Amino acid sequence: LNNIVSSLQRNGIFINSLIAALTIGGQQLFSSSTFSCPCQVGKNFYYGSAFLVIPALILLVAGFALRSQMWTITGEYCPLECKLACLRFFSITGRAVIAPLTWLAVTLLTGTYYECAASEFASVDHYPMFDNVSASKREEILAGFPCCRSAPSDVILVRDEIALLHRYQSQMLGWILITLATIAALVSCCVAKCCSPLTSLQHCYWTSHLQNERELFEQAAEQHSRLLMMHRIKKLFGFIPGSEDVKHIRIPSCQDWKDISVP
Amino acid sequence: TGRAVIAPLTWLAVTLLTGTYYECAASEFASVDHYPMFDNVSASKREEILAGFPCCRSAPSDVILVRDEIALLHRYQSQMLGWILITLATIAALVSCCVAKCCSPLT
Amino acid sequence: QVQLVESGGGLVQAGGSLRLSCAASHMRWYRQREWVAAIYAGTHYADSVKGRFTISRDNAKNTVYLQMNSLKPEDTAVYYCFVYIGQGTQVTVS
């Protein structure tokens, strides 16, 4: 039964779906817990914009870095070898970039981050209520109502309209981004099915072979290290550990401990 | 070192994100000359009340809204620092990994 | 060298009016001690007694003027002033 779970774990679509669901849940928890939408007139666009970008950037970097094989790819970087490196890089990038795309999409769909983000950028010259011959209190109240300040002075309905407008735009952006992303994927796949010299079945078999040989060589290296250490003990103490020791014992002296300290 | 330093980084990040520690920390360092309410010709009661409202003292004398703004400002800064620190940390990790994949002789 | 004196107070019954004047040789008010109002040109009032007082001043006579309307026994206090603390005046309402 657990073998089936591991088999589905090998399915990349399932692991990417798990990543997307986990990122969406984390974003929802973060928004519901620790956002608070600071309401300062001076720099409020900064807070929302940072909430939009920094989590996406750190998730992208984490996805790129958590894959060990990309380090080897870069080391080789720093014919067919170039094509294979490009294919592996594209395949790893896909999973590296799925999560930040999910974060951006869900944030835009929710709309709160964009709502608090570009709120002070709203156009109010159309509305005749906001005269503000001072020209400064207008920006103050504009940044002030979207966060938590109702300020029930007839402006609330206006503010909702403004909010609605921004929210509407947010949704579009999300979907717009989504569209572009999908388009990119398609053309990206085109490259992976146009510049690739290997057959479609050849690529999957080669990847399975690479994973199998990597695991096999790791196991072989561990076993070789184990055998080398076993040999070191059977040459120092004169007996093989884990076997019948009642035959001989070296009884090493003080000078013998220094020899095994070399590695 | 990586595992040695992951935990304190987490503590600093979560503390800054929560903001309470920074809120109570640099509260008396706030700039009040901009606000015309705080004249305080004595110049000492001003610092006293400035340190007094952030902890638990509401002191409902019109200053509460002002104090919230001040709190907000500090809170805002706190968040940035956290994320700023986070950014730097990640950058460090990257270049650190670079060394572990540049100076390393082994494959 | 700056001298402050609270003047214009006294005894008033319910529903009456009282006017306070202070001579000063950026003003605040005190009563007990509790805040009352502030003036510079921005002006604020206490939420406890919001909608009852009115504070004004003029640099011509270097004096500050506070207006209390429909006073009630609930605000029985000694009224002070602050820019240095004024001597203060005691006022009750019956």
Swiss-Prot record, chain A:
Gene Ontology cellular component list: plasma membrane
Taxonomic superkingdom: Eukaryota
Signal peptide extent: none
Subcellular location: Cell membrane
Extracellular side: 34-44, 115-168
InterPro entries the UniProt entry points to: CALHM (IPR029569)
UniProt key word Ion transport: yes
Residue ranges crossing the lipid bilayer per the database entry: 11-33, 45-67, 89-114, 169-192
Keyword Signal attributed: no
Keyword tags: Cell membrane, Disulfide bond, Ion channel, Ion transport, Membrane, Transmembrane, Transmembrane helix, Transport
Cytoplasmic topological domain: 1-10, 68-88, 193-263
GO molecular function: monoatomic cation channel activity
Tissue: Placenta.
Membrane topology: Multi-pass membrane protein
A single GO BP: ATP export
A UniProt-annotated Pfam family: Ca_hom_mod
Disulfide bonds: C37-C116, C39-C147
Physiological role: May assemble to form gap junction channel-like structures involved in intercellular communication. Channel gating and ion conductance are likely regulated by membrane lipids rather than by membrane depolarization or extracellular calcium levels.
Assembly: Oligomerizes to form decameric and undecameric channels. Two hemichannels can assemble in a tail-to-tail manner to form a gap junction.
Family: Belongs to the CALHM family.
Protein name: Calcium homeostasis modulator protein 4
Swiss-Prot record, chain B:
Tissue-level expression: Placenta.
Protein localization: Cell membrane
Extracellular side: 23-76
Superkingdom as given in the UniProt entry: Eukaryota
Regions crossing the membrane: 1-22, 77-100
Record family assignment: Belongs to the CALHM family.
Subunit composition and interactions: Oligomerizes to form decameric and undecameric channels. Two hemichannels can assemble in a tail-to-tail manner to form a gap junction.
Function of the molecule: May assemble to form gap junction channel-like structures involved in intercellular communication. Channel gating and ion conductance are likely regulated by membrane lipids rather than by membrane depolarization or extracellular calcium levels.
Name used for this protein in its record: Calcium homeostasis modulator protein 4
Gene responsible for this protein: CALHM4
Part of the whole protein covered: 108 to 214 of 314
